[PDB]
Amino acid sequence: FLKPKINSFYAFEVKDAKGRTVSLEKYKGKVSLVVNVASDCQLTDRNYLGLKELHKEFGPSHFSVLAFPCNQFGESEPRPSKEVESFARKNYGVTFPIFHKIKILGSEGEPAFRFLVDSSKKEPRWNFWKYLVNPEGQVVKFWRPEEPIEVIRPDIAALVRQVIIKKKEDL
Numbered sequence: 363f364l365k366p367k368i369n370s371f372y373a374f375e376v377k378d379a380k381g382r383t384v385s386l387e388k389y390k391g392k393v394s395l396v397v398n399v400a401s402d403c404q405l406t407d408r409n410y411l412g413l414k415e416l417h418k419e420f421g422p423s424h425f426s427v428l429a430f431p432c433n434q435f436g437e438s439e440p441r442p443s444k445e446v447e448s449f450a451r452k453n454y455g456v457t458f459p460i461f462h463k464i465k466i467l468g469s470e471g472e473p474a475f476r477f478l479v480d481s482s483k484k485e486p487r488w489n490f491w492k493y494l495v496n497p498e499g500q501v502v503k504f505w506r507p508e509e510p511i512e513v514i515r516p517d518i519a520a521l522v523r524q525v526i527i528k529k530k531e532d533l
Contacts (some may be wrong), residue, residue: 370499371396371481374474376430377462379447386460386474391497392424393521395514396478398466399429400438400489401449405507409415409490410454412511417458420518424525427458430475435489478504494518497525 368374371394372386396494400406417427431446433439439446447460464472466479466486478493479485481501494503503517530532 368473368477369497370500371474371477371501374477376464376472376474379431379443379462380458381443381462381511384459386428389426389428391501391525392426393420393497393518393525394426394428394495395518396428396430396433396475396493396495398435398475398486398489398491399446399450399460400432400435402440402490403436403438405490406438409507410450410456413458414454414456414516415511416518417456419515420522421458424529425518427456429458429460430466430472431460431463432464432466432486432489434465435486438489439463451497477501494521496521 372390375383376385376386378384397413399409413427421427431439433441441449443462446463450456450460464475466472466475480499482493482504484504488507490507492505492514493501496502505514
């Protein structure tokens, strides 16, 4: 017997910032930019501002930023999950989902995030690694935290365009 493997990022359930179960199936048929986030690091500001720009331009019908707080990189997410979501909303006015804080490294890795890591073969080494997930729940690209929006935005636009083209064309 050959144990089954999960095919799609959108197959998983996760907890939202308030601790409630969310199925990621609600994002099926959309493009997702999945990012591990943190409120207390050098990279926090540029990332929240940049992700806001992307979510505003492309979302929320055919695209979403999906943000997963994590305290495993320089202990840069100390606050409770609810306060993380407040931070983001109060400081940046973001409307993209901020999920419950998770573990990504170690024995206890969040299965939804481990799926990104296994598919890309790239485990985060810091805050704000980013994973592009197509409408079928497959990872098609990743970016290190060092990479700027100018090289991420065109990949998103393309998949969003094709989502829109496909929806128009098909029944």
